[PDB]
Design a protein around this motif. Structure first.
Motif, PDB file in Angstrom:
ATOM      1  N   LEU A   1       0.827  -1.228   0.000  1.00  0.00           N
ATOM      2  CA  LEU A   1       0.000   0.000   0.000  1.00  0.00           C
ATOM      3  C   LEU A   1       0.848   1.260   0.000  1.00  0.00           C
ATOM      4  CD1 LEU A   1      -2.765   1.498   0.263  1.00  0.00           C
ATOM      5  CD2 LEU A   1      -2.684   1.066   2.692  1.00  0.00           C
ATOM      6  N   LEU A   2       0.485   2.209  -0.843  1.00  0.00           N
ATOM      7  CA  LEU A   2       1.064   3.556  -0.807  1.00  0.00           C
ATOM      8  C   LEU A   2      -0.036   4.592  -0.564  1.00  0.00           C
ATOM      9  CD1 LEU A   2       3.349   5.644  -1.444  1.00  0.00           C
ATOM     10  CD2 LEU A   2       2.505   5.541  -3.767  1.00  0.00           C
ATOM     11  N   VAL A   3       0.151   5.410   0.476  1.00  0.00           N
ATOM     12  CA  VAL A   3      -0.792   6.441   0.898  1.00  0.00           C
ATOM     13  C   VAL A   3      -0.216   7.831   0.724  1.00  0.00           C
ATOM     14  CG1 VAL A   3      -2.239   7.215   2.812  1.00  0.00           C
ATOM     15  CG2 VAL A   3      -1.437   4.851   2.725  1.00  0.00           C
ATOM     16  N   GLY A   4      -1.046   8.783   0.317  1.00  0.00           N
ATOM     17  CA  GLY A   4      -0.614  10.176   0.254  1.00  0.00           C
ATOM     18  C   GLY A   4      -1.517  11.045   1.113  1.00  0.00           C
ATOM     19  N   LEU A   5      -0.991  11.640   2.188  1.00  0.00           N
ATOM     20  CA  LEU A   5      -1.835  12.410   3.099  1.00  0.00           C
ATOM     21  C   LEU A   5      -2.132  13.754   2.497  1.00  0.00           C
ATOM     22  CD1 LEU A   5      -0.168  11.749   6.499  1.00  0.00           C
ATOM     23  CD2 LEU A   5      -1.673  10.260   5.169  1.00  0.00           C
ATOM     24  N   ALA A   6      -3.184  14.393   3.014  1.00  0.00           N
ATOM     25  CA  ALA A   6      -3.789  15.566   2.401  1.00  0.00           C
ATOM     26  C   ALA A   6      -5.051  15.930   3.121  1.00  0.00           C
ATOM     27  CB  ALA A   6      -4.152  15.285   0.952  1.00  0.00           C
ATOM     28  N   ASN A   7      -5.580  17.096   2.735  1.00  0.00           N
ATOM     29  CA  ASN A   7      -6.920  17.565   3.094  1.00  0.00           C
ATOM     30  C   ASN A   7      -7.715  17.766   1.796  1.00  0.00           C
ATOM     31  OD1 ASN A   7      -6.951  18.068   6.121  1.00  0.00           O
ATOM     32  ND2 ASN A   7      -5.212  19.392   5.564  1.00  0.00           N
ATOM     33  N   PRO A   8      -9.009  17.392   1.785  1.00  0.00           N
ATOM     34  CA  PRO A   8      -9.852  17.521   0.576  1.00  0.00           C
ATOM     35  C   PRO A   8     -10.490  18.889   0.432  1.00  0.00           C
ATOM     36  CG  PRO A   8     -11.146  16.583   2.312  1.00  0.00           C
ATOM     37  CD  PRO A   8      -9.760  16.776   2.897  1.00  0.00           C
ATOM     38  N   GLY A   9     -10.836  19.231  -0.803  1.00  0.00           N
ATOM     39  CA  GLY A   9     -11.684  20.377  -1.039  1.00  0.00           C
ATOM     40  C   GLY A   9     -10.855  21.544  -1.492  1.00  0.00           C
ATOM     41  N   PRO A  10     -11.515  22.515  -2.160  1.00  0.00           N
ATOM     42  CA  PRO A  10     -10.836  23.638  -2.806  1.00  0.00           C
ATOM     43  C   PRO A  10     -10.166  24.575  -1.825  1.00  0.00           C
ATOM     44  CG  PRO A  10     -13.243  23.917  -2.973  1.00  0.00           C
ATOM     45  CD  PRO A  10     -12.976  22.541  -2.410  1.00  0.00           C
ATOM     46  N   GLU A  11     -10.644  24.605  -0.587  1.00  0.00           N
ATOM     47  CA  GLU A  11     -10.065  25.486   0.437  1.00  0.00           C
ATOM     48  C   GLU A  11      -8.685  24.964   0.931  1.00  0.00           C
ATOM     49  OE1 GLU A  11     -12.961  23.936   0.560  1.00  0.00           O
ATOM     50  OE2 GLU A  11     -14.688  25.357   0.795  1.00  0.00           O
ATOM     51  N   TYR A  12      -8.301  23.761   0.477  1.00  0.00           N
ATOM     52  CA  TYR A  12      -6.965  23.176   0.727  1.00  0.00           C
ATOM     53  C   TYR A  12      -6.217  22.722  -0.535  1.00  0.00           C
ATOM     54  CZ  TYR A  12      -9.117  22.849   5.331  1.00  0.00           C
ATOM     55  OH  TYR A  12      -9.680  23.136   6.553  1.00  0.00           O
ATOM     56  N   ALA A  13      -6.783  22.931  -1.718  1.00  0.00           N
ATOM     57  CA  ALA A  13      -6.131  22.502  -2.956  1.00  0.00           C
ATOM     58  C   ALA A  13      -4.784  23.200  -3.185  1.00  0.00           C
ATOM     59  CB  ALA A  13      -7.055  22.722  -4.159  1.00  0.00           C
ATOM     60  N   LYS A  14      -3.757  22.395  -3.462  1.00  0.00           N
ATOM     61  CA  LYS A  14      -2.415  22.857  -3.837  1.00  0.00           C
ATOM     62  C   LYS A  14      -1.654  23.438  -2.647  1.00  0.00           C
ATOM     63  N   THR A  15      -2.047  23.042  -1.438  1.00  0.00           N
ATOM     64  CA  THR A  15      -1.347  23.488  -0.246  1.00  0.00           C
ATOM     65  C   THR A  15      -0.283  22.496   0.169  1.00  0.00           C
ATOM     66  OG1 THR A  15      -3.104  22.543   1.130  1.00  0.00           O
ATOM     67  CG2 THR A  15      -3.182  24.908   0.646  1.00  0.00           C
ATOM     68  N   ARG A  16       0.644  22.978   0.981  1.00  0.00           N
ATOM     69  CA  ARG A  16       1.898  22.265   1.246  1.00  0.00           C
ATOM     70  C   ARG A  16       1.628  20.944   1.904  1.00  0.00           C
ATOM     71  NH1 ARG A  16       3.508  27.681   2.657  1.00  0.00           N
ATOM     72  NH2 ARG A  16       5.267  28.448   1.405  1.00  0.00           N
ATOM     73  N   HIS A  17       0.581  20.940   2.723  1.00  0.00           N
ATOM     74  CA  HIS A  17       0.198  19.806   3.534  1.00  0.00           C
ATOM     75  C   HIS A  17      -0.425  18.717   2.669  1.00  0.00           C
ATOM     76  CE1 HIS A  17      -0.183  18.370   7.629  1.00  0.00           C
ATOM     77  NE2 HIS A  17      -1.499  18.260   7.580  1.00  0.00           N
ATOM     78  N   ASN A  18      -0.641  18.975   1.372  1.00  0.00           N
ATOM     79  CA  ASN A  18      -1.055  17.914   0.435  1.00  0.00           C
ATOM     80  C   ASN A  18       0.072  17.250  -0.362  1.00  0.00           C
ATOM     81  OD1 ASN A  18      -3.645  18.581   1.249  1.00  0.00           O
ATOM     82  ND2 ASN A  18      -4.345  19.258  -0.778  1.00  0.00           N
ATOM     83  N   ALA A  19       1.325  17.524  -0.022  1.00  0.00           N
ATOM     84  CA  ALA A  19       2.454  17.043  -0.866  1.00  0.00           C
ATOM     85  C   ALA A  19       2.392  15.546  -1.139  1.00  0.00           C
ATOM     86  CB  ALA A  19       3.794  17.395  -0.245  1.00  0.00           C
ATOM     87  N   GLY A  20       2.179  14.786  -0.086  1.00  0.00           N
ATOM     88  CA  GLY A  20       2.009  13.337  -0.189  1.00  0.00           C
ATOM     89  C   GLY A  20       1.042  12.913  -1.267  1.00  0.00           C
ATOM     90  N   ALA A  21      -0.085  13.597  -1.353  1.00  0.00           N
ATOM     91  CA  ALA A  21      -1.086  13.282  -2.357  1.00  0.00           C
ATOM     92  C   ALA A  21      -0.511  13.476  -3.744  1.00  0.00           C
ATOM     93  CB  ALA A  21      -2.319  14.165  -2.173  1.00  0.00           C
ATOM     94  N   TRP A  22       0.257  14.534  -3.934  1.00  0.00           N
ATOM     95  CA  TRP A  22       0.808  14.850  -5.254  1.00  0.00           C
ATOM     96  C   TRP A  22       1.600  13.669  -5.769  1.00  0.00           C
ATOM     97  CZ3 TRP A  22       3.434  19.986  -3.350  1.00  0.00           C
ATOM     98  CH2 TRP A  22       2.443  20.850  -2.876  1.00  0.00           C
ATOM     99  N   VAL A  23       2.318  13.000  -4.867  1.00  0.00           N
ATOM    100  CA  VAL A  23       3.113  11.820  -5.238  1.00  0.00           C
ATOM    101  C   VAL A  23       2.236  10.651  -5.673  1.00  0.00           C
ATOM    102  CG1 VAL A  23       4.748  10.076  -4.393  1.00  0.00           C
ATOM    103  CG2 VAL A  23       5.060  12.433  -3.794  1.00  0.00           C
ATOM    104  N   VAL A  24       1.180  10.384  -4.916  1.00  0.00           N
ATOM    105  CA  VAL A  24       0.219   9.374  -5.335  1.00  0.00           C
ATOM    106  C   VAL A  24      -0.424   9.752  -6.651  1.00  0.00           C
ATOM    107  CG1 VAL A  24      -2.029   8.408  -4.877  1.00  0.00           C
ATOM    108  CG2 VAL A  24      -0.266   8.409  -3.127  1.00  0.00           C
TER     109      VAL A  24
END
Ligand code: NA
Length: 193
Positions: A8-31
């Protein structure tokens, strides 16, 4: 004994436009990227509380996941999916924004502390308090931390982050085609030598 150490590979993040492209979504970008590169679109799956996908790399199944739990509740998505496919924490790799590493740097790590990422805290907790899952630490710098972590990186800095995403992806492919050790060696040298 274990021809596939990461299932399993997981990418952490927060959903929704009020968090889109924020630093705390980096993990998701990798997935996202790894999935893009293998022509898989992620689907929401309520039972797993996030966007899932199954990737065929080197003719092995690598499952991927971006929780929609909100960051500090990431553990429940991860546990739901790992319990379904009986996947040990040790077989899970979690990509996440890492404050302790600069933009443009990425490192693997197994076990240890969360470094104040509550996403990791909650993942550890929801995996029966087992720390020993692998991490992919995406560097985002220090600076106000709430504002930074949930901020967008300035454009020059964003391309530093994207380079690091790109490297991480290469090293994940390597991990799957050529083994964990070869991927660990490559990322360890990244920006270091
Ligand atoms: Na995003």
């Amino acid at each position: 004994m274990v021809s596939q150490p990461i299932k399993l590979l997981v990418g952490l993040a927060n959903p929704g436009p009020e968090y889109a492209k924020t630093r705390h979504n980096a993990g998701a970008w990798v997935v996202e990227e790894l999935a893009r590169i293998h022509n898989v679109t992620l689907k929401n799956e309520p039972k797993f509380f996030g966007l899932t996908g199954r990737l065929l790399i080197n003719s092995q199944e690598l499952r991927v996941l971006i929780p929609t739990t909100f960051a500090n509740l990431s553990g429940k998505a991860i546990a739901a999916l790992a319990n379904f496919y009986q996947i040990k924490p040790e077989e899970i790799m979690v990509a996440h924004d890492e404050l302790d590493l600069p933009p443009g740097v990425a490192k693997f790590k197994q076990g240890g502390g969360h470094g104040g990422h509550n996403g990791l805290k909650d993942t550890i907790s929801k995996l029966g308090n087992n720390k020993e899952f692998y991490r992919l630490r995406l560097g985002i710098g220090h600076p106000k931390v709430a504002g930074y972590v949930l901020g967008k990186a300035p454009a020059k800095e964003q391309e530093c982050l994207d380079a690091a995403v790109d490297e991480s992806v290469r090293c994940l492919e390597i991990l799957m085609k050529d083994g964990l050790t070869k991927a660990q060696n490559r990322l360890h040298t990244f920006k270091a030598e």
